[PDB]
Design an enzyme around this catalytic site. Sequence first.
Site, PDB file in Angstrom:
ATOM      1  N   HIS A   1       0.826  -1.197   0.000  1.00 48.90           N
ATOM      2  CA  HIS A   1       0.000   0.000   0.000  1.00 48.90           C
ATOM      3  C   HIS A   1       0.860   1.247   0.000  1.00 48.90           C
ATOM      4  O   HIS A   1       1.987   1.231   0.505  1.00 48.90           O
ATOM      5  CB  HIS A   1      -0.995  -0.003   1.168  1.00 48.90           C
ATOM      6  CG  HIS A   1      -2.066  -1.037   1.035  1.00 48.90           C
ATOM      7  ND1 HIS A   1      -3.022  -1.249   2.005  1.00 48.90           N
ATOM      8  CD2 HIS A   1      -2.340  -1.914   0.037  1.00 48.90           C
ATOM      9  CE1 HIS A   1      -3.837  -2.213   1.613  1.00 48.90           C
ATOM     10  NE2 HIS A   1      -3.441  -2.638   0.423  1.00 48.90           N
TER      11      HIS A   1
ATOM     12  N   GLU B   1       0.836   3.879   1.575  1.00 51.58           N
ATOM     13  CA  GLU B   1       1.172   4.361   2.894  1.00 51.58           C
ATOM     14  C   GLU B   1       2.381   3.609   3.429  1.00 51.58           C
ATOM     15  O   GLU B   1       3.260   4.211   4.059  1.00 51.58           O
ATOM     16  CB  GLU B   1      -0.027   4.214   3.830  1.00 51.58           C
ATOM     17  CG  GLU B   1      -1.208   5.132   3.501  1.00 51.58           C
ATOM     18  CD  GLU B   1      -2.135   4.570   2.438  1.00 51.58           C
ATOM     19  OE1 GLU B   1      -3.202   5.171   2.197  1.00 51.58           O
ATOM     20  OE2 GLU B   1      -1.796   3.542   1.817  1.00 51.58           O
TER      21      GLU B   1
ATOM     22  N   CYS C   1      -5.967   2.887   4.940  1.00 52.70           N
ATOM     23  CA  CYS C   1      -6.737   1.761   5.498  1.00 52.70           C
ATOM     24  C   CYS C   1      -6.373   1.567   6.979  1.00 52.70           C
ATOM     25  O   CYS C   1      -5.369   2.126   7.470  1.00 52.70           O
ATOM     26  CB  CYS C   1      -6.483   0.467   4.709  1.00 52.70           C
ATOM     27  SG  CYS C   1      -5.004  -0.421   5.268  1.00 52.70           S
TER      28      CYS C   1
ATOM     29  N   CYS D   1      -2.706   0.481   7.562  1.00 55.70           N
ATOM     30  CA  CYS D   1      -1.732   1.538   7.298  1.00 55.70           C
ATOM     31  C   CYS D   1      -1.856   2.703   8.276  1.00 55.70           C
ATOM     32  O   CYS D   1      -0.865   3.376   8.569  1.00 55.70           O
ATOM     33  CB  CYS D   1      -1.822   2.018   5.853  1.00 55.70           C
ATOM     34  SG  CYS D   1      -1.285   0.763   4.645  1.00 55.70           S
TER      35      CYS D   1
HETATM   36 ZN   LIG Z   1      -3.305   0.163   3.731  1.00 64.12          ZN
END
Ligand SMILES: [Zn+2]
Length: 184
Positions: A61, A63, A92, A95
């Site tokens: 991800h 992040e 999310c 993250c």
């Molecule tokens: Zn994430």
Amino acid sequence: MDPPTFTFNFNNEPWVRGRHETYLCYEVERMHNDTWVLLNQRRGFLCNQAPHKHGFLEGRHAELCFLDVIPFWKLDLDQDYRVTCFTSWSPCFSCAQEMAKFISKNKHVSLCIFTARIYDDQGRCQEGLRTLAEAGAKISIMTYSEFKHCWDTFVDHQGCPFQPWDGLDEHSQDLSGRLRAILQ
Ligand SMILES: [Zn+2]
């Protein structure tokens, strides 16, 4: 970043339709121990790393990739820094805890996250945003100002000034109401 990509990814029209990626632009500014001013350190952008058999199998991800580049790929460690992120989607649950960890264990990093749309999986995402704020991160919704800044700073506009899409302000206002309710 090419203009179509920016406009497609940072458009704040609620629809989760096509935008399967998360772009993240960042700026780093040193605190300056004497005066009130911030010093330009660095800047850049990135997006998530889709699942890949020759890379991150379970995906990476945006992040997490962001936290990957910070590690001494920048500098110093005993100074105070302002870190600002402009993300097309908010983090999310997983993250958010990871970023909250980072700022909690560092103290010398002020994190401000400006997001275009709010991920919200309706599950633990809301809790994740509350955790990040609890950790001291400033989490806010992108408005005309943040969109224009990113356009001028991170887009190959080739001299073209920023042109707001219709309803930008409206969606920006609505998203702000939702975030404020999520946090409190
Ligand atoms: Zn994430």
